[PDB]
Amino acid sequence: PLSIMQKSVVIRPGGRQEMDEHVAIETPYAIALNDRVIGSSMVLPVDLEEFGAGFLFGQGYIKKAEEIREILVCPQGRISVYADKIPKEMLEEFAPLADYCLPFAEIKSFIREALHSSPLGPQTHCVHGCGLWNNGRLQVYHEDVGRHNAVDKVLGSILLGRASNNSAVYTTGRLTSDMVLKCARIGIPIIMSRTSPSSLGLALAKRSGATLVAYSRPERINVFNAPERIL
Amino acid sequence: PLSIMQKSVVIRPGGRQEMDEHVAIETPYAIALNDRVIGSSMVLPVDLEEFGAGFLFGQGYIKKAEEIREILVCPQGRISVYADKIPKEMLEFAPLADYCLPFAEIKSFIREALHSSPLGPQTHCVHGCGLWNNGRLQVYHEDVGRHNAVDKVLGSILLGRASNNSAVYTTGRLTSDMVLKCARIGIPIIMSRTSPSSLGLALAKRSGATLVAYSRPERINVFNAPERIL
């Protein structure tokens, strides 16, 4: 289950009408590494294997796909990861990013396929989404109530070999510091948003070399760094 | 200094075009309590006294405005609070104030909040949160993070600068922590331009707080306790 039907009263100057609404589900999950609870988050309860891997990578517990042995999801509120908010040491030298470059012409298809991938946003207006594009195709697309979680789910995909870092990432969320940082650390070279960057977001993209695209629309984009990757 | 000019490159199928943009400032601050750093946050660096106090309330350290003695703000990234991320004791309610909002003032409240600062229209990168009572906008705060904008409002109430006997409006979604914070300080009417989550709505139901979503000048969707709308 990802949403619940709920009644509201719409009030206007003329009067009051009852109405049916879709309301997105937000729910706490604990994240455990090798049977020890590392943390906890409010999540949209979908794609939680991916969420688990990506959250631990974001916190700095895991660095490579290869360390992950298995991940179990319990509907009681636990994701258990088995392996062999940002830390201070993450903010401060970036390894090289992938060589993917984005044909400007596929931008309309990337954005269309992303926005059309799930009906939850049109229904609930309470979820962000994040996807990866390579080879003229939307490889994966995750939503969550929190934009940082949706990105974590994208990272978890890469870490579980379900997607490649040789990709463009699009998000409906703002490209603040933590959002860019996650993408840069896993090696994604093109980071795109429907909306704005922060100054720290921008400054991380400049340090890493990453292409950062804002205000993305099907046939218009504002590139703030490395516009060479847009073909 | 709340934004910065940055060169952008606008690209269309027709061609290309340089441009200047204005980008909201996001910068880290440590919050200390009686000289121990309790935590750190990325903020918009305005109304930081309010932020320090409301951050510590939201975290469960401060319970009353009376506990607060002094707050020192160091513009190189520390707010130091002197007093005598969601907690679990907060989530699992004392009475709320008895303000009720006249429907006709809703347009005034939204217009005023939305016209209060140019940062949103400049940068598209900040959330706002305001309080309304006595036919006027008593305070309005902005931040890069919706949770922080609310923390600032909490901070004003706690600093004697605003009343909990008010309706609150935010541009952010009414997810769990947003509702929890406002209900914990006693605010009876909690409104957003946008949507609630299920846990946000659960908390409103438990506290008895009026929860209003998809708020427009002349149309609101009330999900709990519509009687407080006059």
Short mmCIF file of C-alpha atoms in Angstrom, two decimals:
data_model
loop_
_atom_site.label_atom_id
_atom_site.label_comp_id
_atom_site.label_asym_id
_atom_site.label_seq_id
_atom_site.Cartn_x
_atom_site.Cartn_y
_atom_site.Cartn_z
CA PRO A 1 0.00 0.00 0.00
CA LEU A 2 1.31 3.48 -0.96
CA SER A 3 -1.75 5.68 -0.37
CA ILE A 4 -5.08 5.85 1.50
CA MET A 5 -8.42 7.36 0.58
CA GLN A 6 -9.45 10.14 2.95
CA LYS A 7 -12.32 12.55 3.17
CA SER A 8 -11.96 16.31 3.28
CA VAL A 9 -14.32 19.27 3.24
CA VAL A 10 -13.60 21.83 0.54
CA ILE A 11 -14.64 25.26 1.81
CA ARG A 12 -15.31 28.25 -0.43
CA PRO A 13 -17.20 31.53 0.00
CA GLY A 14 -20.38 29.99 -1.42
CA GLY A 15 -20.35 26.98 0.95
CA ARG A 16 -18.90 23.54 1.87
CA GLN A 17 -18.51 20.32 -0.16
CA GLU A 18 -17.25 16.94 1.00
CA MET A 19 -14.53 15.36 -1.18
CA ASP A 20 -12.56 12.13 -1.68
CA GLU A 21 -8.77 12.50 -1.60
CA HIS A 22 -5.68 10.29 -2.10
CA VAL A 23 -3.17 10.72 0.70
CA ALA A 24 0.41 9.40 0.39
CA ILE A 25 1.61 6.94 3.00
CA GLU A 26 4.53 8.09 5.22
CA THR A 27 5.82 5.45 7.64
CA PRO A 28 8.95 4.84 9.81
CA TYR A 29 11.44 2.09 8.91
CA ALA A 30 14.55 1.17 10.85
CA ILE A 31 17.64 0.38 8.80
CA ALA A 32 19.95 -2.33 10.18
CA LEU A 33 23.47 -3.39 9.07
CA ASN A 34 24.56 -6.92 10.06
CA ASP A 35 21.69 -7.09 12.62
CA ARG A 36 22.51 -3.71 14.28
CA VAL A 37 20.09 -0.81 13.78
CA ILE A 38 21.98 2.06 12.14
CA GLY A 39 19.21 4.56 11.73
CA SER A 40 15.64 5.26 10.76
CA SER A 41 13.65 7.17 8.19
CA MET A 42 10.14 8.23 7.15
CA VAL A 43 9.51 6.50 3.81
CA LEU A 44 6.98 5.80 1.11
CA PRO A 45 6.96 2.02 1.57
CA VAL A 46 8.08 0.96 -1.86
CA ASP A 47 11.49 -0.17 -3.30
CA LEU A 48 12.87 -0.56 0.17
CA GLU A 49 15.69 -2.98 -0.79
CA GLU A 50 17.06 -0.16 -2.94
CA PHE A 51 16.31 2.34 -0.16
CA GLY A 52 18.28 0.24 2.35
CA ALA A 53 21.46 0.00 0.24
CA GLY A 54 21.36 3.66 -0.84
CA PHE A 55 20.68 4.99 2.70
CA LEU A 56 23.73 3.13 4.04
CA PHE A 57 25.90 4.35 1.14
CA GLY A 58 24.64 7.94 1.85
CA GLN A 59 25.60 7.57 5.54
CA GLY A 60 29.00 6.14 4.65
CA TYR A 61 28.59 2.51 5.82
CA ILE A 62 28.87 0.96 2.37
CA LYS A 63 30.95 2.09 -0.65
CA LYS A 64 30.77 -0.66 -3.21
CA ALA A 65 28.12 -2.87 -4.68
CA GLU A 66 30.45 -5.83 -3.92
CA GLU A 67 30.17 -5.51 -0.10
CA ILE A 68 26.41 -6.19 -0.18
CA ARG A 69 25.39 -9.77 0.57
CA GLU A 70 21.62 -9.46 1.04
CA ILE A 71 18.83 -7.11 2.09
CA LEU A 72 15.52 -8.19 3.65
CA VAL A 73 12.41 -6.09 4.06
CA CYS A 74 9.97 -6.73 6.95
CA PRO A 75 6.52 -5.04 6.81
CA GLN A 76 6.90 -4.48 10.56
CA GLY A 77 9.25 -1.53 9.91
CA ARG A 78 12.72 -2.92 9.35
CA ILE A 79 15.06 -3.17 6.43
CA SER A 80 17.92 -5.55 7.22
CA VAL A 81 21.08 -5.16 5.21
CA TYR A 82 23.86 -7.82 5.25
CA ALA A 83 27.26 -6.61 4.10
CA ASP A 84 30.94 -7.34 4.40
CA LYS A 85 21.80 13.77 7.17
CA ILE A 86 25.40 13.55 5.91
CA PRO A 87 28.73 12.71 7.66
CA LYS A 88 31.46 15.38 8.00
CA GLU A 89 34.09 13.57 5.85
CA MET A 90 31.67 13.25 2.90
CA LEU A 91 31.42 17.03 2.29
CA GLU A 92 35.22 17.40 1.85
CA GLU A 93 37.80 14.84 -2.81
CA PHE A 94 35.80 13.31 -5.68
CA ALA A 95 36.84 10.23 -7.64
CA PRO A 96 36.13 10.52 -11.43
CA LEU A 97 32.55 10.46 -12.76
CA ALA A 98 31.21 8.31 -15.63
CA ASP A 99 31.50 9.23 -19.36
CA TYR A 100 27.80 9.32 -20.25
CA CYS A 101 26.62 12.34 -22.27
CA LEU A 102 22.99 13.22 -22.84
CA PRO A 103 21.57 13.89 -26.27
CA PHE A 104 19.52 17.08 -25.84
CA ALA A 105 16.83 15.38 -27.98
CA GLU A 106 16.15 12.56 -25.48
CA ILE A 107 15.44 15.07 -22.69
CA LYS A 108 11.73 15.26 -23.65
CA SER A 109 11.50 11.44 -23.57
CA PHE A 110 13.42 11.16 -20.23
CA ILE A 111 11.13 13.73 -18.56
CA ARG A 112 7.93 12.30 -20.11
CA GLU A 113 8.78 8.70 -19.12
CA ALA A 114 9.77 9.85 -15.58
CA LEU A 115 6.59 11.87 -14.99
CA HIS A 116 4.45 9.16 -16.51
CA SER A 117 6.07 6.33 -14.69
CA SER A 118 3.76 6.40 -11.67
CA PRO A 119 0.33 7.87 -10.98
CA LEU A 120 1.12 8.63 -7.30
CA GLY A 121 2.20 12.25 -7.83
CA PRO A 122 -0.91 13.26 -9.79
CA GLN A 123 -3.06 11.42 -7.17
CA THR A 124 -1.47 12.51 -3.86
CA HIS A 125 0.77 15.59 -4.69
CA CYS A 126 3.03 14.32 -1.87
CA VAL A 127 5.83 12.32 -3.54
CA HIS A 128 9.09 13.18 -5.23
CA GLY A 129 10.57 10.95 -7.90
CA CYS A 130 14.05 10.28 -9.18
CA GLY A 131 15.14 8.33 -12.27
CA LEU A 132 18.14 7.27 -14.37
CA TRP A 133 18.41 7.48 -18.18
CA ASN A 134 20.90 5.76 -20.44
CA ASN A 135 20.73 4.01 -23.85
CA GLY A 136 17.60 6.02 -24.87
CA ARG A 137 15.63 4.42 -22.06
CA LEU A 138 14.45 5.02 -18.47
CA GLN A 139 16.40 2.37 -16.61
CA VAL A 140 14.80 2.95 -13.19
CA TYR A 141 12.49 5.39 -11.42
CA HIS A 142 11.74 5.55 -7.65
CA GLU A 143 9.44 7.76 -5.62
CA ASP A 144 9.26 8.66 -1.97
CA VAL A 145 7.78 11.20 0.31
CA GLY A 146 11.28 12.66 0.85
CA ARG A 147 13.42 13.80 -2.10
CA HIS A 148 16.57 12.53 -0.31
CA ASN A 149 15.01 9.05 0.06
CA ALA A 150 13.95 8.97 -3.65
CA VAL A 151 17.62 9.64 -4.56
CA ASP A 152 18.80 7.02 -2.09
CA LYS A 153 16.52 4.52 -3.83
CA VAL A 154 18.31 5.43 -7.13
CA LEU A 155 21.70 4.89 -5.50
CA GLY A 156 20.50 1.56 -4.05
CA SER A 157 19.55 0.51 -7.56
CA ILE A 158 23.07 1.19 -8.81
CA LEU A 159 24.54 -0.54 -5.79
CA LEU A 160 22.45 -3.65 -6.43
CA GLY A 161 23.43 -3.86 -10.12
CA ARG A 162 19.89 -2.96 -11.21
CA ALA A 163 21.09 0.29 -12.84
CA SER A 164 24.27 1.93 -14.11
CA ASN A 165 26.04 5.11 -12.86
CA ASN A 166 26.81 5.75 -16.55
CA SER A 167 23.54 7.76 -16.73
CA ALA A 168 21.65 11.10 -16.44
CA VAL A 169 19.71 11.47 -13.17
CA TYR A 170 16.45 13.53 -13.14
CA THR A 171 14.62 14.50 -9.95
CA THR A 172 11.46 16.45 -9.17
CA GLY A 173 13.39 17.68 -6.06
CA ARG A 174 15.61 20.71 -5.49
CA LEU A 175 19.34 20.14 -5.96
CA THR A 176 20.56 21.05 -2.49
CA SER A 177 23.95 19.96 -1.06
CA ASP A 178 23.06 16.40 0.04
CA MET A 179 21.25 15.64 -3.29
CA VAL A 180 24.23 16.53 -5.53
CA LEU A 181 26.71 14.97 -3.10
CA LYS A 182 25.01 11.55 -3.24
CA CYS A 183 24.98 11.64 -7.04
CA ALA A 184 28.59 12.82 -7.28
CA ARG A 185 29.89 10.18 -4.85
CA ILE A 186 28.33 7.29 -6.81
CA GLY A 187 29.78 8.72 -10.07
CA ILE A 188 26.74 10.07 -11.92
CA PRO A 189 27.95 12.83 -14.29
CA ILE A 190 24.64 14.59 -15.23
CA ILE A 191 22.29 15.73 -12.42
CA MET A 192 18.98 17.27 -13.50
CA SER A 193 16.02 18.84 -11.66
CA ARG A 194 12.55 20.08 -12.55
CA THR A 195 13.42 22.99 -10.30
CA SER A 196 16.22 24.85 -8.55
CA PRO A 197 19.71 24.33 -7.08
CA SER A 198 21.10 25.76 -3.87
CA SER A 199 24.43 27.53 -3.75
CA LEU A 200 26.06 24.54 -1.97
CA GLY A 201 24.50 22.10 -4.40
CA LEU A 202 26.05 24.21 -7.20
CA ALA A 203 29.40 24.39 -5.44
CA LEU A 204 29.52 20.58 -5.00
CA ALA A 205 28.74 20.08 -8.70
CA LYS A 206 31.63 22.43 -9.59
CA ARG A 207 34.08 20.56 -7.29
CA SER A 208 33.04 17.16 -8.70
CA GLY A 209 32.88 18.27 -12.36
CA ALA A 210 29.30 17.15 -12.64
CA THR A 211 26.83 18.58 -15.11
CA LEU A 212 24.02 20.26 -13.18
CA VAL A 213 20.78 21.08 -15.01
CA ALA A 214 17.86 23.04 -13.37
CA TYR A 215 14.34 24.08 -14.41
CA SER A 216 14.31 21.13 -16.76
CA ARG A 217 11.55 21.16 -19.30
CA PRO A 218 11.19 18.92 -22.39
CA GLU A 219 12.56 21.57 -24.73
CA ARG A 220 14.43 23.96 -22.43
CA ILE A 221 17.04 23.64 -19.64
CA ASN A 222 19.25 25.80 -17.50
CA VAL A 223 22.70 24.23 -17.26
CA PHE A 224 24.76 25.63 -14.26
CA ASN A 225 27.96 23.57 -14.81
CA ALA A 226 29.63 21.40 -17.51
CA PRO A 227 27.24 22.00 -20.40
CA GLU A 228 29.65 19.95 -22.59
CA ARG A 229 27.77 16.74 -21.61
CA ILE A 230 24.60 17.89 -23.25
CA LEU A 231 24.95 16.80 -26.90
CA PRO B 1 23.12 37.91 1.90
CA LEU B 2 20.56 35.25 1.01
CA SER B 3 21.23 34.57 -2.62
CA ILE B 4 23.99 34.66 -5.22
CA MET B 5 24.12 35.50 -8.91
CA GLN B 6 25.38 32.58 -11.03
CA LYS B 7 25.87 32.13 -14.74
CA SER B 8 23.60 29.67 -16.40
CA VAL B 9 23.35 28.46 -19.96
CA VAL B 10 19.84 28.12 -21.35
CA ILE B 11 19.60 25.45 -24.05
CA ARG B 12 16.67 24.86 -26.42
CA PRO B 13 16.21 22.98 -29.70
CA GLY B 14 16.21 26.43 -31.34
CA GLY B 15 19.71 26.99 -29.81
CA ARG B 16 21.62 28.36 -26.75
CA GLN B 17 21.67 31.54 -24.54
CA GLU B 18 23.72 32.64 -21.50
CA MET B 19 21.82 33.94 -18.47
CA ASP B 20 22.27 35.08 -14.93
CA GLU B 21 20.45 33.31 -12.17
CA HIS B 22 19.93 33.89 -8.49
CA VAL B 23 20.61 30.93 -6.26
CA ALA B 24 19.49 30.64 -2.61
CA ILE B 25 22.31 30.36 -0.02
CA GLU B 26 22.47 27.01 1.81
CA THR B 27 25.09 26.93 4.56
CA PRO B 28 25.76 24.75 7.60
CA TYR B 29 25.25 25.94 11.20
CA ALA B 30 26.06 24.04 14.42
CA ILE B 31 23.50 24.40 17.21
CA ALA B 32 24.92 24.27 20.69
CA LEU B 33 23.10 24.03 23.97
CA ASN B 34 24.98 25.24 27.08
CA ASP B 35 28.18 24.91 25.03
CA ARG B 36 27.63 21.32 23.74
CA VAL B 37 27.06 21.00 19.98
CA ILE B 38 23.76 19.12 19.77
CA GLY B 39 23.58 18.97 15.98
CA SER B 40 24.04 20.77 12.70
CA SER B 41 21.72 21.88 9.92
CA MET B 42 21.85 23.40 6.43
CA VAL B 43 20.01 26.69 6.70
CA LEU B 44 19.14 29.88 4.95
CA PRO B 45 21.17 32.22 7.16
CA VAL B 46 18.38 34.58 8.39
CA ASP B 47 16.40 34.50 11.71
CA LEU B 48 19.01 32.25 13.34
CA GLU B 49 18.19 33.13 16.97
CA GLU B 50 14.61 31.90 16.25
CA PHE B 51 16.06 28.83 14.52
CA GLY B 52 18.31 27.83 17.47
CA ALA B 53 15.45 27.94 19.96
CA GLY B 54 12.93 26.20 17.66
CA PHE B 55 15.51 23.56 16.62
CA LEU B 56 16.02 22.65 20.31
CA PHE B 57 12.27 22.56 21.00
CA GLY B 58 11.73 20.35 17.91
CA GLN B 59 14.48 18.04 19.21
CA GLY B 60 13.00 17.76 22.70
CA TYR B 61 15.72 19.74 24.63
CA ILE B 62 13.62 22.83 25.44
CA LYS B 63 10.03 22.57 26.69
CA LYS B 64 9.12 26.11 27.80
CA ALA B 65 10.05 29.64 26.72
CA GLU B 66 11.05 30.26 30.40
CA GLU B 67 13.94 27.83 30.19
CA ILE B 68 15.73 30.13 27.73
CA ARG B 69 18.33 32.59 29.01
CA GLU B 70 20.34 33.81 25.98
CA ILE B 71 21.23 32.86 22.42
CA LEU B 72 24.45 33.96 20.71
CA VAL B 73 24.75 33.80 16.97
CA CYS B 74 28.16 33.53 15.36
CA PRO B 75 27.90 34.28 11.63
CA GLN B 76 30.76 31.83 10.92
CA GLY B 77 28.36 28.99 11.65
CA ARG B 78 27.32 28.51 15.25
CA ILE B 79 24.24 29.37 17.16
CA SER B 80 24.73 29.02 20.91
CA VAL B 81 21.72 28.60 23.11
CA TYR B 82 21.77 28.99 26.89
CA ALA B 83 18.97 27.27 28.69
CA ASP B 84 18.18 25.20 31.76
CA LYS B 85 15.93 14.17 12.81
CA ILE B 86 12.74 13.20 14.69
CA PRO B 87 12.65 12.17 18.39
CA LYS B 88 10.62 9.10 19.35
CA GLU B 89 9.16 10.52 22.58
CA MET B 90 7.52 13.34 20.58
CA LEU B 91 5.73 10.98 18.16
CA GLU B 92 4.16 8.62 20.75
CA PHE B 93 -0.84 16.10 23.30
CA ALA B 94 -1.59 18.97 25.60
CA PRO B 95 -4.49 21.24 24.76
CA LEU B 96 -4.22 23.56 21.78
CA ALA B 97 -4.88 27.31 21.79
CA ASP B 98 -8.43 28.35 20.84
CA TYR B 99 -7.88 30.66 17.92
CA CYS B 100 -10.38 30.25 15.02
CA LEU B 101 -9.77 31.67 11.53
CA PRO B 102 -12.33 33.78 9.63
CA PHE B 103 -12.60 32.40 6.13
CA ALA B 104 -12.46 35.89 4.51
CA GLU B 105 -9.04 36.54 6.09
CA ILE B 106 -7.52 33.47 4.31
CA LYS B 107 -6.87 35.47 1.16
CA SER B 108 -5.25 38.22 3.22
CA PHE B 109 -3.07 35.66 5.08
CA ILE B 110 -1.84 33.90 1.90
CA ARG B 111 -1.32 37.14 -0.06
CA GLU B 112 0.66 38.64 2.78
CA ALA B 113 2.78 35.53 3.38
CA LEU B 114 3.39 35.07 -0.36
CA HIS B 115 4.15 38.80 -0.87
CA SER B 116 6.34 39.09 2.23
CA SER B 117 9.72 38.20 0.70
CA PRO B 118 11.16 38.23 -2.80
CA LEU B 119 13.45 35.14 -2.28
CA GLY B 120 10.99 32.54 -3.54
CA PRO B 121 10.29 34.39 -6.80
CA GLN B 122 14.05 35.15 -7.17
CA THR B 123 15.50 31.67 -6.47
CA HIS B 124 12.64 29.16 -6.36
CA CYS B 125 14.64 27.48 -3.54
CA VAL B 126 13.02 28.42 -0.24
CA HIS B 127 10.03 27.47 1.79
CA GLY B 128 7.99 29.95 3.88
CA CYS B 129 6.08 29.59 7.16
CA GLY B 130 3.95 32.34 8.77
CA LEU B 131 1.57 32.91 11.68
CA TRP B 132 -1.70 34.82 11.52
CA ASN B 133 -3.87 36.24 14.32
CA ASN B 134 -5.69 39.56 15.05
CA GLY B 135 -6.16 40.11 11.32
CA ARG B 136 -2.46 40.31 10.54
CA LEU B 137 0.65 38.37 9.70
CA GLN B 138 2.57 38.30 12.95
CA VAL B 139 5.69 36.62 11.68
CA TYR B 140 6.92 35.03 8.51
CA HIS B 141 10.18 33.03 8.13
CA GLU B 142 11.96 31.40 5.23
CA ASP B 143 14.55 28.67 4.77
CA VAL B 144 15.95 26.27 2.23
CA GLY B 145 14.36 23.44 4.32
CA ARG B 146 10.67 23.38 5.15
CA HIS B 147 11.36 21.79 8.53
CA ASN B 148 13.71 24.73 9.37
CA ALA B 149 11.15 27.43 8.33
CA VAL B 150 8.74 25.87 10.84
CA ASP B 151 11.51 25.65 13.50
CA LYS B 152 11.96 29.45 13.07
CA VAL B 153 8.25 30.02 13.65
CA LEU B 154 8.46 27.82 16.75
CA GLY B 155 11.45 29.93 17.77
CA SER B 156 9.53 33.19 17.55
CA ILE B 157 6.75 31.82 19.70
CA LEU B 158 9.35 30.63 22.25
CA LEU B 159 11.14 34.00 22.19
CA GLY B 160 7.97 35.95 23.03
CA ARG B 161 7.85 37.34 19.49
CA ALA B 162 4.67 35.57 18.39
CA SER B 163 1.71 33.74 19.81
CA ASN B 164 0.66 30.09 19.46
CA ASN B 165 -2.90 31.52 19.43
CA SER B 166 -2.72 31.65 15.63
CA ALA B 167 -3.16 29.83 12.31
CA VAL B 168 0.09 28.63 10.66
CA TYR B 169 0.59 28.55 6.85
CA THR B 170 3.48 26.86 5.09
CA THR B 171 4.42 26.34 1.49
CA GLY B 172 5.67 22.85 2.51
CA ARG B 173 3.85 19.50 2.66
CA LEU B 174 2.28 18.59 6.02
CA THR B 175 4.29 15.45 6.67
CA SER B 176 4.72 13.95 10.15
CA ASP B 177 7.34 16.27 11.65
CA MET B 178 5.73 19.45 10.37
CA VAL B 179 2.41 18.65 12.11
CA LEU B 180 4.12 17.26 15.24
CA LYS B 181 6.09 20.46 15.82
CA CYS B 182 3.08 22.76 15.51
CA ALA B 183 0.78 20.60 17.64
CA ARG B 184 3.46 20.27 20.30
CA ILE B 185 3.68 24.09 20.66
CA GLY B 186 -0.13 24.40 20.75
CA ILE B 187 -1.01 25.89 17.32
CA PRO B 188 -4.70 24.88 16.57
CA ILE B 189 -4.84 25.51 12.82
CA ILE B 190 -2.17 24.16 10.52
CA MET B 191 -2.33 25.06 6.81
CA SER B 192 -0.28 24.32 3.70
CA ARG B 193 -0.33 25.42 0.01
CA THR B 194 0.08 21.69 -0.75
CA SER B 195 -0.64 18.16 0.53
CA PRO B 196 -0.59 16.17 3.83
CA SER B 197 0.90 12.69 4.30
CA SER B 198 -0.95 9.96 6.13
CA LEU B 199 1.14 10.37 9.32
CA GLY B 200 0.72 14.20 9.19
CA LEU B 201 -3.03 13.60 9.03
CA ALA B 202 -2.88 10.95 11.82
CA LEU B 203 -1.11 13.49 14.09
CA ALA B 204 -3.66 16.22 13.39
CA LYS B 205 -6.46 13.74 14.24
CA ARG B 206 -4.75 12.79 17.52
CA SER B 207 -4.01 16.38 18.54
CA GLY B 208 -7.44 17.63 17.39
CA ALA B 209 -5.67 20.27 15.25
CA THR B 210 -7.41 21.76 12.25
CA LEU B 211 -5.48 20.56 9.18
CA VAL B 212 -5.97 22.50 5.97
CA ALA B 213 -4.40 21.51 2.61
CA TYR B 214 -4.24 22.85 -0.96
CA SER B 215 -4.83 26.32 0.51
CA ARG B 216 -5.88 29.06 -1.97
CA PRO B 217 -7.23 32.61 -1.35
CA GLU B 218 -10.81 31.39 -1.80
CA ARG B 219 -10.70 27.57 -1.55
CA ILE B 220 -9.28 25.29 1.16
CA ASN B 221 -9.47 21.50 1.74
CA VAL B 222 -9.96 20.76 5.42
CA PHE B 223 -8.93 17.20 6.48
CA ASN B 224 -9.66 17.70 10.17
CA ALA B 225 -11.72 19.91 12.52
CA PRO B 226 -13.40 22.29 10.03
CA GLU B 227 -15.27 24.14 12.90
CA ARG B 228 -12.23 26.35 13.51
CA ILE B 229 -12.85 27.85 10.07
CA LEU B 230 -15.47 30.59 10.63
#
